[PDB]
Structure formats: C-alpha cells, structure tokens
Amino acid sequence: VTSPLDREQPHFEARDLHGTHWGRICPTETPEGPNCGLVKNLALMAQI
Amino acid sequence: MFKYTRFEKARIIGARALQISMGAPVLIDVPPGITPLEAAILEFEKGVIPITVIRP
Amino acid sequence: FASRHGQKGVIGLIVPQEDMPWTESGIVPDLIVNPHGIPSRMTVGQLIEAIGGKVASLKGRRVDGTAFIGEPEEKLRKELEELGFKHTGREIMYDGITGKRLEADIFIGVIYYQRLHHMVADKIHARSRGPVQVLTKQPTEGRAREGGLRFGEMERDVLVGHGAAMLLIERLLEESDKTEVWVCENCGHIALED
Amino acid sequence: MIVPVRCFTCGKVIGDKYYEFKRRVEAGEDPEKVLDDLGLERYCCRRMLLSHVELIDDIMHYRVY
Amino acid sequence: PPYNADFDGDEMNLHVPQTEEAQAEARILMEVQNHIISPRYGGPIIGGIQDHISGGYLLTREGAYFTRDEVEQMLMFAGVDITELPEPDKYDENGNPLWSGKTIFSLLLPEDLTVWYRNKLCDEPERCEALEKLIEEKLMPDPEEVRKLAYDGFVYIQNGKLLSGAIDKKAYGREDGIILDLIVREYGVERARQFLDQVTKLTIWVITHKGFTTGIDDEDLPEEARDRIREIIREAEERVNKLIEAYKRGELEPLPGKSLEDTLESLIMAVLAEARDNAGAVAEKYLGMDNHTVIMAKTGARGKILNITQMAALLGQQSIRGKRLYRGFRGRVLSHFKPGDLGARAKGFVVNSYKSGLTPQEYFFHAMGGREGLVDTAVRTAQSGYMQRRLINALQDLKVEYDGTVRSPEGIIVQFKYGEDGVDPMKSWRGKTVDVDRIIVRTLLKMRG
Amino acid sequence: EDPKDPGGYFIINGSERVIVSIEDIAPNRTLVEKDERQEKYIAKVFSYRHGYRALVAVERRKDGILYVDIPNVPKPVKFVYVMRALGLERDKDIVEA
Amino acid sequence: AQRLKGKEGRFRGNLSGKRVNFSARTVISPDPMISINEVGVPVEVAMELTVPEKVTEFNIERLRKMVLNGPDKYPG
Amino acid sequence: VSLSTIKSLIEKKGANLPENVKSELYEKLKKYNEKYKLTKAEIEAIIDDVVKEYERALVEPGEPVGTVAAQSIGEPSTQMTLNTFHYAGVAEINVTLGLPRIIEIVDARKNPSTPMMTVYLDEEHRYDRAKAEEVARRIEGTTLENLARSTTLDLINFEFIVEIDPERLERSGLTMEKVVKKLESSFKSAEFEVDGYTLIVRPKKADKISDLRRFAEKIKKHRLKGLSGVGKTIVRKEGDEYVIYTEGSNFKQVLKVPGVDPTRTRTNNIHEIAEVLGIEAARNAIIDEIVSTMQEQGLEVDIRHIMLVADMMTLDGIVRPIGRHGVVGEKSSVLARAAFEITVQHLFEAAEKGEVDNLNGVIENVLIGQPVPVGTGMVKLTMKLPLRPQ
Amino acid sequence: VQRIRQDRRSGKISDVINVAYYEDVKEVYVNSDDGRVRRPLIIVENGVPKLTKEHVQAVKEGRLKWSDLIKMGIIEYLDAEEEENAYVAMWPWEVTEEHTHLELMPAAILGLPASLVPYPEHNAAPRNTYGAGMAKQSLGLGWANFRIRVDTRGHLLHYPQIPLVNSRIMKAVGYEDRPAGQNFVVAVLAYQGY
Amino acid sequence: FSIFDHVLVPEHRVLSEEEKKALLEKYKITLAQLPQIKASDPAVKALGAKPGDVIEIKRKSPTAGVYYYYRVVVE
Ligand SMILES: [Mg+2]
Ligand SMILES: [Zn+2]
C-alpha cells in the first residue's frame, strides 16, 4: 500500500504509526530511505 | 631557507619532479628503479634544492 | 550476508579449517561473528535463536518460534542443560594455531543466515579511458557502458579545503573536455579560424 | 535441491542416510533415537538431516532440452 | 572514523592522479599520517576502535600475566624489533617465568615519556587522590611505591614504563587519545604511525588468543535485583495513578506550565524517567566487571549503560516528539484499553525488557517509538546537506594571506589576524593556543632527570 | 506454471505488472480542519461522480461570515448567497437547514 | 533556460562536477595487517588503471622489463 | 627566583606571545616555583620551549580557512536531533534546539521561533527571592483573559460575564480595583461593572446582536501590568544569584525597567541586540548562541570557525543572512552568484548592468579551468638557470 | 445499531455493512462502500466467547469452514469505524464482562516478511525493520519455473534449508516449501581483527 | 546608562589622522577595504563619530586576551 504524498517534504504526521493501524498495517515492514512511513504493507489479518 | 610551509614544499617537489621527468639531470645519485617523484623527495631531503620561492 | 535479526556484514576473511578453533565436543564453527555487534544493536532474539537451533538439532525436532506464543527461553535453557551442555550455551574451545584452550569459554550455536544478492562480482567497476558522451564529451554514466565515477561538488569543496589546486585541475579539466580556442584581442568574441 | 553428500562442517558422509531417517521418523519412531542409531552424534551433522528439504522432485517437471 | 565507514556493504571510490605535480600534491598534502589530528576540535581522529581498546584493557588489566611463548609470539606479531626478553616479573609454580602486561606494553612506548591522568574506569576516587598526592609531592616518586599504590583508574607512565593503570579509550581512542596525541605532538607523524601500527596488532593478538565473547547469560541478573526492579516499577505506577486521581478530583496544582493537562504529562514523564534511571542504577550495580559486556561498555569500546539497562531491566517510556503516545482512537491509542485512561501502561510505558520479552501492546508502542527515529534521520540528512551547501557557497574562497590577515576576494579585510590568535585549530592543543602546564612539566622532568 | 503461484498480476508485453493500492481520503465525507494562519475554520469534501472529483469547502473567517468555495469559481461566495442560488430563498429555510 | 539551471543543468552538475577517468569503485573489507597509510587494491583494478611514467636514466631497466611483461602479466 | 625576575624574563623573551599566554604563563610559573624550587636556567628553558611551541603552532599562509570552517560547522550538523525535547518541564521555557536553532541563527530570521530573554538582577533584588518576584511582576505580562479562571461571553443580555480567580492576583500581587482602573483607563463607553470576582462590560455598540462578541473579546484580550510582548516569567537561582527568563522579547524597553541589571541582560534576538547595542555586540551574540547550542548538544566545535562565520556575517554593519539575499548576494562575481541559485535572473541582471567579472574566486577559476588562488595556487617560484649537476 | 448488529450477525444482510454511533454528537454512521480495511474478531457475549471447543473440533475435522463461522455470527469483521465502540480483550483468559470482542491471534498483526523473524519481540524495532526489509533480498529457490522462465535477472541457491527455529505462520503461508537460506554453526569471538 | 558598559559591547575609540595613515599603510589598504559600521549605530552615536573616520575596537577574545578590530564609518 502506497501513499500519494510527495516524498521530498517531511510529512512528519503522515509518516508516523497511527493507533488504528493495529491489525491493518504491518508496524515494522517499511522502506529505509525517503519512503519510510509512506510505503506500507497489509497485515496478515486484513480483509479489504 | 627560513621556513617552508606545506604548500611551498609541495609546489617545489612537484616542479622538480616535472623537470626531472621532462629530461633535467638529477644532482643526487639515486637508487635504480625509482620513480621521478621519489627522486624529487630524496633530493629535497638531502637539502639540495635549485628552486627558490618568492614572498610578497 | 545477513541474519533475520538485522545483523548484516560482508565476508572479511576466509580461513582454512585447520586454523579454526574447535569446541571440546568436536564442533568447528562455520562462521564467526564479532562480540561487539551484539550490544548497541540490542538483538537478544539472535542469542535466543542461537540457543534454540542447537537445542532443536540435538533433540531432533524443530522449535516453535512464533511471535508471542513461542517456546519460552527458560524451557530451551533447561532442555539444553538436560542434553549434557551448559545452560549458558557456552563451550570450551582450543585455539587453532597454538593448540591450547582459550582462557574463557565461548558462546556457540546454530543461527539461520541468508546470502544477499549484493555480491561484489556485480559491484566492481573500473574506467581507464572509455567512451564519452556527445554534448558534454564527458565520460558516460553506468557500469554497462564503461562509465566513469562521479566527482561531485562536495568532492570539489573537499579538494579546495585540502588546498590542492593542481590536483583539482587534474581531476576536473585535464582528463575531460580539453579544448583550445582562438579569440580576438579587442572584441573578445570567439575568433573564427579559416 | 537434493540431499548434500557431506556435512558442511565436519565432512562426515551423510548423503545415504536421509531417506532411511525420513522413513523411520515417519513410521513413528522418536527422531532422537533414530539419529543416534544412524551414527550422527555431533549436532552439526544432525542439523543437515533435520533441516533438509527435498526440492528436486517438484523442479523435475520443467524440462529444457 | 575519518571515512565514517563500516564493512556492512559500503562502497568507496579510488582516484589515480596522472601528472607529476598532482602526485606530489597528493603525496605531501593528503598523506594519511598527516591527518591524525582533526581540524574540528584539535584532537586525534585516527585512533583505535573496538577491539583495540578492549584488547588493551585485557592486556594491561590487573592480574594479567603472560608466559614466555606468548610474549615472544605477540612481540613478533606486532612487529617490534626486540632481541632479548626483559627480566621476568613473577615466577609461578613449576618455575616458569611470567611477564606482566604492563612491561609488554611499555616495550612499545618511547624512552622519554611522562604523563598521568584519570580514565573512564575510575570508581574509587580515594586511590586516585592518594596516587596524585604521591606524584605531586615530588615529581619523580620511587617506582616501587607507585607499584605499591597502583590502581586501574590512574594511568601513570614514567620514562616509558607503565607503572600503574589500564588501557582505556582515553589512551589512544578515537576522541581523547591522550597518549596518541602526546606522541604525535612531541615526536612526529612517523613515530605516531609506528606506535599505532604496533599497538593495534598487539591488542588484536591479545584479544584473539585470550578469548573474548558475549552470550545469553550476560544479562542474567540474580533474584534480588529482579525483585528490586519489580518493586521500583510498581511504586512508579502507583505514584502515576495517584497523580491521575488527584488530577481527576481537580486538586492538582497548576505548574507554571500553562495547561493543567501539560503539567500532568510533565509530572508523569519525570516520574517514569526517574524510575527507569533507578532501575538502570540497580542493574548496573548487580553486574560486575568480570562480565565481558560490562567491560565493553565501561571502556567505551562499544555501547553504553543504556543498552545494558534496556536489555536487562526494562525499556522504559516510549514517546514521539517529546510527548507520550496519543494518536489512535478517540481517547485511547489502542482499542484494548478503556477510553479516557491515562495510566502509565496505557500511554506507552513498557515495563518489560528485551530479555524477558514484550507483550503485543508494548511491541506496538516500541515500533511507534522507533519509526520516529527512522524518519528523523531521513529528514535530518537533507536539512543538514542544504545548510552545508549554503555555508560552503558563502565562505568558499577566504584564505590567509602572507601577512596573517584574511581578505575577501575583492580585497575587504575580514579579519586582521586569523582566529584572533593566528594559530591553526588543527595544531592547537584541544582548542587552547598552547598547553603551558604540559610544557612546564615536560621540561622540568627532562632536565631534573 | 508453479502451483504455488498466487496470481493477481497482469502481463503486459511479456513483463509482469502489478497494481499497488493507493491510499486516498474517504470520499463524500466531511472533514473539518484548522487554518491558524488565516484563522479560518474549514471543512472539505471530495465529492465523486463518474470519476470526477470536486473539492467543495465552506469556511468561517475572523468576521464570522461563512463563505463557500466551488470549483471553477474564482473567489469564495457568501454561504447564504449560494444557498439562495439553490432555491430555498426564504431566510427561515436556511435557519432551519 | 531550463538547460542552464537545475541540479542536472549546465551550471551545476556539468562544470562543477562531472564523470572522471582513471577511477574505480568496489566494496571495502577490513585488513589490519597493512599500515594505516596503505590501501589494498585488487590485482584486476591495477591491470586496468595506469600511471604514465617518463623513461629516464634511473628507471630504464624497470620500465623495459615491465614493457617486456606485456599487458597480461601483472607487472606490465 | 623573585617574581619580578620571572616577569622580566617573560617580557624579555616572550615578546610575540599573546596577552593570555603571558598571563597564564606567569600564573603557572608562580605556582610551580612556590611548590618546587626552580632555577633561572629552568625558567629560561621553559620560556624558550613555550616560544618554540607558539611559533610552531602558527597558521600556514595560503590555508583555505573558509572552507575548513564551513565543513567544521556542517559535518556535525548531520548529528544533532532535529527533533529536540519539546518539553520545558519545570522552571524552564521550551526553546528550539539542535538543527532548527542553528538554521535560524544562520539565516538571521527577523524574529526567532521562541524569543526568550535573560534578565540578570541588579545588586538589590538579586539575593532576595521576594524582591525577585517583585522585579518579575514589574516585567511579567498578563492579559485580562489570563487572569480569569472562567469567562462567559453572555449574548442573552449582551454583556460580559467573567469569573476571575484569586490565583492570578495572588501571584501578580494585583488587586481587583487595580484591574478595574486599568480597564477604565484603557477603554471608554464600557460599563466595567466592578464586582468581587466578576466584571460586566456592556458598551452601546454591544447592545445590538451583530456587534457584541468581537468587541467583548477585544476588551478581554487587553494586557495589563506587563511590559509589551512578555509572557510567563520563570525565576530561578543560578549559583547564588537569582535570574529571570521571559517568553517573548522586547530588549529595547526592558533595559529601562527598575531593578534590572543592564550590564548582563541578554536576549536571543540578534536583530534586537544589533538595533539596541550595535553590530559588534551582535557578533558576540551570534558566537555565544552557536557555542551554547553546540555545547548543549554534546558536539565539540572549535571557536575559530564560528568566529570566522560571525565576522563574515557582520561585514557591512548589518546582520545579513548567508542565503541568496545576504552574503552570497553581495559577491561581485556574476558567475559565482549564478552557480549558487537563481541563475537566469542574475545573468540577465548582470547583462543589463554591464557588470565585469574579474575571476578572483574559486568557482570562476574552476569553471574556466585555471588554478584556484588558495593553497598551492598562490605560490610563486623562481630558479637560477645555470644548474650545475655536481 | 443493536438491531442492525443483530441482523448482520444472524445473516439477514451482508457482512460488509458496518455501523458505528457517536454518543457525543448523536450521530449514526453506516458504511457499505468500497476499499475499507478490516480485521476479524471473535464476538464476546456476556463475558463468554461465542467460539466454543466443539467449533474448533469441527473446524479441525474439516466439517466447518471459515465462511461458515462468519455466517454463524461467531466471527465478525470490524473496520476502523465500528472498532470505535469495541473493547477488545487480548487474551482468552482476560475476558471480562465489559469486553465485547476477543483477539484471534496477536501474532498476525505483523506483515508477511516481518513474520520471518523468530522471537521478534526480543529485538529493537529498527533491527526488526532491517531484518524484514532484508528478507526480501536473500537468494533461494523462489519459484520452480526458474529453469524455463525468462527474467532479466535471477538467482538460485544450491542447497536451501528450512530454518531450525521458525514461526508456525510460514508453514501455513507456504514459505517452508521455498526456503531462502541455510543453517550455520556460529561462534561469537574476535579472530585476528578481520 | 551607556551601551559601553554592557558585557557584549567591547570598547570603541575614534582614531586620529596620523594612526589612520599608519594603519592604512601597514596593511597596504585604502579606506574602501575596511569593514563598515553604520552611522546610526548606537556605538557611533555614543562616540559622536562622523562618516570618514575609522573606529578602533578592542575585542576580548577567548583565544587571545587583546585583539584590535577596525571599522570605517558609513551612512
Ligand atoms: Mg554502512
Ligand atoms: Zn558434521
């Protein structure tokens, strides 16, 4: 799952881990570089 | 001389190495197989230097 | 090479078998890691897996390592104690060269390691003369087309900071885009040769 | 793909003992006693038989000539 | 340390100058041994790291002794051109000679070197005070008395003989390598290069053939420490709950902090930080210096006490941007807590340790904590890069003229004497224009000796 | 084909292309945000119809007057002006709504 | 206008910095047995990168021998 | 030997030494001479060694100090936390720290993010805590709504309903009638009905529906008893001296407040110091601020680089930024400015003005491929032709 | 909302309808649109989970499927809206009266690569992130078609091995049929400084 | 109160013509090469200076006890 926001800007609030991600977004798997927090992977127990 | 700064020593050694490479004779006996640059360092360490530096 | 707990590294040296240490029970390590990498990385999971691997191999059954319902560490240490090994997981080894036992007992176990695809055979790159581009006539970019490495602005400031003017000239202009141009001495416009 | 001929660490030939171990452990025997009976004592050898996966059978279907 | 490189997949570029002048400039100006002292703070930068410091401690620790074969082998491995072994120090059982580590180390030092200081391993100031009194009474006390009052924590070298002390990060470390700095300032770059090339190999041999390891039991605290830690955590949680109840009743006294809620959060964070500090104190107290991890942390080779107290006692409090975890559902971070709960655990306090395992909620809180550090580095790199580019373009072409003044390209005089003093920061004594005390002591010891 | 292959990807010109899911704001929902620079309290809706998006915002400035932002309209219009433009001309109607 | 300006524009990134000849890049591995002012170079890189040397009286023998070695033996 | 003899020997030999070197040498010589007996030869040798060390420590002509200073300020910048604590805690005021503070200092923003002042007390009121809050209240600034515990902008009767707590008047030392008379003096045509803990404001324009809440809020906003633009005032004893700290900043006006010691009073607004005290004081202010930040974050940076930066920033009597609108904008060379930023506009402006580039910088010489005038590029060499091989 | 919940759990309407109410503003929200992210939870009624032992036995024997449990009112999906009114119990023994749901398996909150790390709760978060990211770069028998496939690049590991210490999830997701690493014998000590 | 008593304000002094020429000759400079100090500067106003003169500033540096800095007065 990817976010449409531009990577260059900080986006401090967007990159953080929200509390509602529990069970919907993996808390650990994320890229290292500028994509940190803007690229995320579904948790195992997810159902779109 | 009085005192040689790092830049002046580097400049003098470079100029002497270039002159030696282009065909200038060496005023100090050197071991065989040495590169021109190391010949320049040996020449400088011996103390025989033919290039002077101009100060303002 | 890298482990599942985040420890990464490159092979530093390949050692003949007879120079490797060996435990008092007859085990020769496959791979040696540095003890300084454990703290300040804080990966106790690697040590727990090291204990669990040898426990599983001795017991003949695989070990559950699920996130929160896995086998507790204390059970693994007790099982290791029951199989004739120290609960701490340490063993006594002898030095490969001298042939006498080391003063301290050493930690040894079985850990799962993965070989990454960043291999040196695909990263080495050299450029002596090579071809050049069209517009700028500078060396090309990329390993495939015998490109040259990049000497950016930061390297320029570093070379200025050292105070090596002629080295800067040699790295920038002498070996790329040498040119000669005629100019008239009253307009300064580029003189056109015939 | 297929069972290694020798243990990676010490070099004991264990290539011929994999199928016997698999059959015995599948029959119901305790794997520890089976491994002890086969002669494997150091855990470096036991690891190779325990963690091996046979993948030659499901890649044999795709042929290239 | 200069390149800031690690052997975990890093790549480096190599350039070959082609002209003789370029080669001479590279050889004279940019040789590695010419840049041992950093121009940022006037201290050493090319020094020992990790195993060098740890092996130095192992070699020169108290009680370390080496046999004939070990001494000869390590001396040959280091490269020292010795020809006859010194007189044995102690004779063990069966009539075999033994040499202390201090003698072997002192074989690597110059003949005329005298320096004394306190390193990081000091824990009993009284011993250092007594040693300082002995040294200060007369500047050359008899060596036997100093050996009598030896103590790891006061490095003292007398005419190249290591009389008392243990090798630490303060000896030849990356930041405050006193011995390396003294050698490179008083003898020359070549002598410093030789000294470094010998000590690195000797320490590597010591740490390789003596054995050095860390294991799962390096954090095995005894029962008493665990009970104490549980008591501390329970008391802290009770205090936090009392504060919360006082806030709910409205009896809370507003701090100079504008908002009552902010006062409550500040008090809670202070309480939790103090709790973690006390737990770290007791955990550090119950682990001795025989533990290898404690050795690595104390000498500065790798890590710090925070890693030990987080792997042994508890992680502590997780926070983002200096505030407790608050983002999530309405009034609660996770759906597993009741809304409106402000307790310690409900907002991020993790009472478990890495060795004891984390519950899933603590795991999620810790992940939320670490994401902040990751994004922080990611943004900080770019901000720092842009700032450095602006600074470089601003101050690129200033230089020192032949009269000592610093002038702008057009001719404006920026400074009438560089640095107000005229002394290069690289050649300065850790920012001082000149170290008077060291010169006085060195001269006095040299002539009177 | 490998039986373990999960599928769920396209093949375009012999290359396997996968569509990554985009994370967008929920449509046809009102979200109220704070704009302290102009001291305006803004609510935004992204109305969707036949693939077209429409950012419609109603905001209250310091003066306490409500203005509505509509696409293709150069400047904000007063709230009750556009409300009257939708019929519902009587003031009591706006008061009730 | 856009050709001159920008990170990849003419003014910066094209005269300020550029690709260079006689350079190499590869991963780094530790080696404590060499002096601090030395670098271990793969033999393959040495065969490719070259240093022009002018033939003088004191290095005629070595240069002659290395020319005799050809471009396939190492000291060539 | 006698101390006067030591002074004479110091003056006779150490002629070129700096003043601090001479003073420190004299002090240490006195101490070591009283502790241990020293001969004349020993003192002479010590002074000779000190002179030799000072001479050897001098900078080498041609050194590119500017680039070294820039790198020394920039390399540690990748190490401080851009995200600071963001928690004042107790007896503190939150201030931007780390990278953002350094960026704000360098860019010379007209107003900082967290303007915080430091008010050292005079001889009186310094050792007295009660007099310390007296001075604080003399400078502490509070508004009308700040005093009240609760406030209800009553629209039913179109008047003001406010419930003031005793806490604010207790801390500030004020009284209800003081606030009453301040409101009377500040505004007219308002009821300002005096009550115990209540105030009623009902001006004529507030009687209607459309003109009540805004005017009531405006009157409620007014600040009294306080110096303009000053928020909370924390008082804390440092060593044996109480000091004051303030949110907001007004350096021009505070210096005339009784009880303030103008000598040691400082603020974190460099432009304010420049306008009040001058450019030469702003230089020291910048140096001290950068040093404080670097020391606070634990990174060690030599003072000389910050000295160079501050000296360059205040070259024209104005604290200009280092950005495109400041020091870089003042460069005479057109190509140097074009390479940095906004290339096209600068090129066209230079074409209009018909400027001339003399190529006296590093960037231009790099572009044209000629030796830069730093380091080895400034050395000039001559030699005698009739070389004798010997 | 109680009526709609009862109808949803009985099976009268679809299971994609989610209802949440907000007491403070007196609003009721019904969601039936596309693209919501939801997770399953066990319904708790009067402090008693609705999933009993015989249901687990039936699932094990194959007589019952997951869809049947969904349609029986035992397990319901919750989106971010409906979870606002929930009070979930993490463990089966922690269920009390006020709890309305029970977590199925807390170890499943992690992504697919993040489940590879054994004992992931004993590691620092950055190291777990690095390991999860690096699990996607290791070599191994990724797919059985490597011989006849035509990809630009590809790697094959000659002797892959199942991890000795493994989470029970990767046996279910099929990782153990395509392993990507080997089991090493690791010793922790310093050797020659290399 | 005067601004010269503040700790951040170093001493100032107006140079006369003779030492002006001496200083201008010592560094081989003209009046344009010196740093500039504005006329409306509080230090200049306190000293009663006039554009054209140069101000001698005695700095208090941490590295060196005494250091002299000179600035030319402009409007
Ligand atoms: Mg790296
Ligand atoms: Zn084996």
Structure tokens at H329: 């904008």
Instruction: For residue E13, give the 3-state DSSP assignment.
Output: strand
**Edge-to-edge strand ranges of the sheet holding H241-247:** H233-238, H241-247, H116-120, H266-267
Strand pairing partners for E413? E407
Q: E strands, I26-114, where? A: 27-31, 39-45, 48-49, 75-78, 88-89, 101-102
The ligand that comes nearest to the alpha carbon of residue D44 is: 2
For I57, residues 6+ apart whose C-beta sits below 8 A from its C-beta are: none
Q: Where are the beta strands (DSSP E) in A1-48?
A: none
Q: What are phi and psi of H99, to 5 degrees?
A: -60, -45
Distance CA I171, CA I116 (A): 11
Is residue E192 exposed (0-12), middle (13-18) or buried (19+ Cβ within 10 Å)?
buried
Task: Tally Cβ neighbours within 10 Å of residue E32.
Answer: 15
Rounded CA gap, I78 and I100, in Å?
12
Instruction: Phi first, then psi: give them for residue I44, nearest 5 degrees.
Output: -110, 125
- Residue I41's SS3 state is strand
Structural determination approach: cryo-EM
Strands J36-38 and J67-74: what pairing?
parallel
* Rg of chain C in Å (alpha carbons): 30
CA F88 to chain centre: 24
Residue type for position I5 = R
Look at C149 and G44 and tell me if their CB atoms are within 8 Å: no
- 8 Å CB contact between H61 and H206: no
Tokens of E45: 């930068």
Give the chain H residue whose CA is nearest to the CA of E255. Answer: H90
The angle that helices C44-59 and D43-50 make with each other, rounded to 10 degrees, is 90
The residue type found at J2 is: S
Burial E135-173 (b: 16+ CB within 10 A, else e): beeebebeeeebeebbbbbbbbbbbebbbbbbbbbbbbb
CB E388 within 8 A of CB H71: yes
The pair of structure tokens assigned to I5 is 């919940």
From C82, C6, C84, select the one nearest C41 (Cα to Cα): C6
**CB distance E2 to E10 below 8 Å:** no
Distance between CA atoms of residues E392 and I117, nearest Å: 45
How deeply is A20 buried, as exposed, middle or buried, from its count of CB atoms within 10 A (0-12, 13-18, 19+)?
Answer: buried
* Subunits close to J (at least 3 CB pairs below 8 A): E, H
When scoring G12, G14, G57, G58 by the number of chain H Cβ atoms within 10 A, the one with the most, hence best to mutate, is G12
Asked if E426 and H304 count as a contact pair (C-beta separation under 8 A), the reply is: no
* Whether C43 contacts I127, CB under 8 Å: yes
CA distance E5 to E11: 9
Q: Tokens in use for F3?
A: 């039986």
State the Cα angle at J60 between J59 and J63, rounded to 5°. 115
Cα angle, residue E213 at apex, residues E209 and E217 outer, rounded to 5°: 150
Q: Which two tokens stand for residue H309?
A: 């930066």
Q: Is F5 on the interface with I (CB under 8 A)?
A: yes
Sign (positive or negative) of CA dihedral D30, D36, D39, D42 = positive
Contact E96, E68 (CB under 8 A): yes
Chain G adjacent subunits, 3+ CB pairs under 8 A = B, C, E, H, I
Q: Is the dihedral of CA H357, H360, H362, H367 positive or negative?
A: positive
Looking at the complex, does the CB of residue H28 fall below 8 Å from at least one CB of chain J? Answer: no
In single-letter form, the type of residue at position E289 comes to: M
The single-letter DSSP state of residue J4 is G
Resolution, angstroms, 1 dp: 3.0
Comparing CA positions, the residue from E440, J59, I178, J36 lying closest to residue H47 is E440
What is the number of CB-based contacts under 8 A between chain G and chain H?
17
AA identity, residue E439: I
CB contact under 8 A, I192 and G30: no
DSSP assignment string, B4-49: --HHHHHHHHHHHHHHHHHTPPPSS---TT--HHHHHHHHHHHT--
**Which residues in chain F have their CB less than 8 angstroms from residue I149's CB?**
none
Q: Where are the alpha helices (DSSP H) in F46-89?
A: 79-85
What CA–CA distances, in Å, run from D7 to C15, D15, D30, G9, J31? 18, 8, 22, 59, 87
Closest-lying ligand to the alpha carbon of D13? 2
Give residue J7's Cα distance to chain centre. Answer: 17
Q: What is the C-alpha to C-alpha distance for residues E124 and C160, in angstroms, rounded to an integer?
A: 49
Cross-strand bridge partners of residue F58: F43, F68
Contact C155, H67 (CB under 8 A): no
Beta carbons of J73 and J49 less than 8 angstroms apart:
yes
Q: What are phi and psi of E35, to 5 degrees?
A: -115, 35
Helices E189-210 and E51-60: angle between axes, nearest 10 degrees? 70
The answer to whether the beta carbons of residues H38 and H45 sit under 8 Å apart is: no
Tokens 């101390």 correspond to: H3
How long is chain E? 449
| Cα dihedral H184→H188→H191→H197 (10° resolution) | -30
Which chain E residues touch G45 with a CB distance below 8 Å?
14
**Which residues 6+ apart lie within 8 Å of I3 measured at CB?**
none
Q: Is E6 annotated as belonging to a binding site?
A: yes
Could you tell me the sign of the dihedral formed by the alpha carbons of C48, C50, C51, C56, in that order?
positive
d(CA E228, CA F27) in angstroms, rounded, equals 55
Q: Report CB contact under 8 Å: G23, E15.
A: yes
Q: Is E100 left (phi over 0), alpha (psi -120 to 50) or beta?
A: beta
Helix (H, G, I), strand (E, B) or coil at E129: helix
Q: Give the residues across from H162 on adjacent strands.
A: H151, H199
Q: What does the H/E/C string look like for E293-333?
A: HHHHHHCCCCCCHHHHHHHHCCCEECEECCEECCCCECCEC
Angle value at C-alpha I178, between I177 and I179, nearest 5 degrees? 105
| Conformation bin of residue H384: beta by default, left when phi > 0, alpha when psi is -120 to 50 | beta
F:20-59 residues touching chain I, CB 8 A cutoff: 27
E305 to each of C40, E298, H104, how far by Cα in Å? 10, 8, 34
Q: Is H139 helix (H, G, I), strand (E, B) or coil?
A: helix
Judge residue I106's burial from the number of C-beta atoms within 10 Å of its C-beta, 0-12 exposed, 13-18 middle, 19 or more buried.
buried
Tell me how far the alpha carbon of residue C4 lies from the centroid of ligand 2, in angstroms.
24
**Cβ neighbours of E21 in B, within 8 Å:** 14-15, 17-18
Query: Are H62 and B53 contacting, i.e. CB atoms less than 8 angstroms apart?
Result: no
Nearest to E357 among I121, I128, I192 (CB): I121
**Is G2 an 8 Å CB contact of chain H?**
no
H204/H129 Cα distance (integer angstroms) = 46
Residue pair J44/H301 in contact (Cβ under 8 Å)? The answer is: no
Scanning chain C, the segments in alpha helix (DSSP H) are: 44-59, 73-82, 153-162, 165-169
Q: CB–CB of E22 and C157 under 8 A?
A: no
Residue carrying the six token digits 């021009």:
H252
Phi, psi of E350 (to 5 degrees): -105, 115
Contact call for residues C169 and H375 (beta carbons, < 8 A): no
Q: Residue H37 CB: number of other CB atoms within 10 A?
A: 9
How far is residue G59's CA from residue G53's CA, in Å, rounded to a whole number? 9
Tokens matching residue H284: 């020291």
Structure tokens belonging to residue B16 = 């002497």
Name the phi and psi angles at H73, rounded to 5. -80, -30
The residues with which E138 forms a beta bridge, in sequence order, are none
Question: d(Cα E218, Cα H191) in Å, to the nearest integer?
Answer: 76
Query: Which of E53, E46, E75 has its CA nearest to residue E192?
Result: E46
In Å, what is the CA distance from I122 to each residue of C5, C154, E273?
10, 41, 22
D44 labelled as ligand-binding?
yes
**List of E strands, E87-184:** 90-91, 97-100, 114-118, 154-158, 161-164
Residue J1: exposure state from Cβ atoms within 10 A (0-12, 13-18, ≥19): exposed
Which residue of G lies nearest to I192 if distances are taken between CA atoms?
A: G32
DSSP E86: P
Which amino acid appears at position D33 of this protein?
K
CA distance H171 to D49: 80
Q: What is the DSSP string of J38-71?
A: ETT-HHHHHHT--BTBEEEEEE--SSSS-EEEEE
Please report, for residues C105, E228, E286, E290, E308, the alpha-carbon distance to residue E221 in angstroms, rounded to integers and kept in the order given. Answer: 19, 11, 7, 14, 11
DSSP H or E stretch at residue E253: none
Closest residue to C31, CB basis, from I155, I167, I184: I184
Across the interface, whether the CB atoms of C162 and H374 are under 8 A apart is answered: no
CA–CA distance, H119 with H260 (Å, rounded to integer)? 7
Question: Which structure tokens are listed for E91?
Answer: 């004779």
Residue F1 touches chain I, beta carbons under 8 Å: yes
Enumerate the H helices of chain H as residue ranges: 3-13, 19-35, 40-56, 65-74, 99-107, 129-139, 144-147, 166-172, 176-186, 213-221, 251-254, 270-276, 279-297, 303-313, 334-340, 343-353, 362-368
Residue corresponding to tokens 């976010």? A3
End-to-end Cα distance, chain F: 62
Q: Which two tokens stand for residue E9?
A: 């997949």
Asked if D45 and C25 count as a contact pair (C-beta separation under 8 A), the reply is: no
Closest CA to E280 of E228, E346, E213, E357: E228
Choose among E71, E51, E356: nearest CA to E200: E51
Q: Is E8 annotated as a binding residue?
A: yes
Q: Is C173 in the H-facing interface, judged by CB distances under 8 Å?
A: yes
Helix E436-448, helix H19-35: angle, nearest 10: 40
CA distance G15 to chain H (A): 6
Ligand nearest to the CA of E5: 1
Largest alpha-carbon pair distance within chain B? 40
Question: How far is E68 from E98, CA to CA, in rounded Å?
Answer: 7
CA F25, A31, H297 angle in degrees (round to 5)?
A: 100
**Secondary structure class of E205 (helix, strand, coil):** helix
Q: Which ligand is nearest to the CA of C10?
A: 1
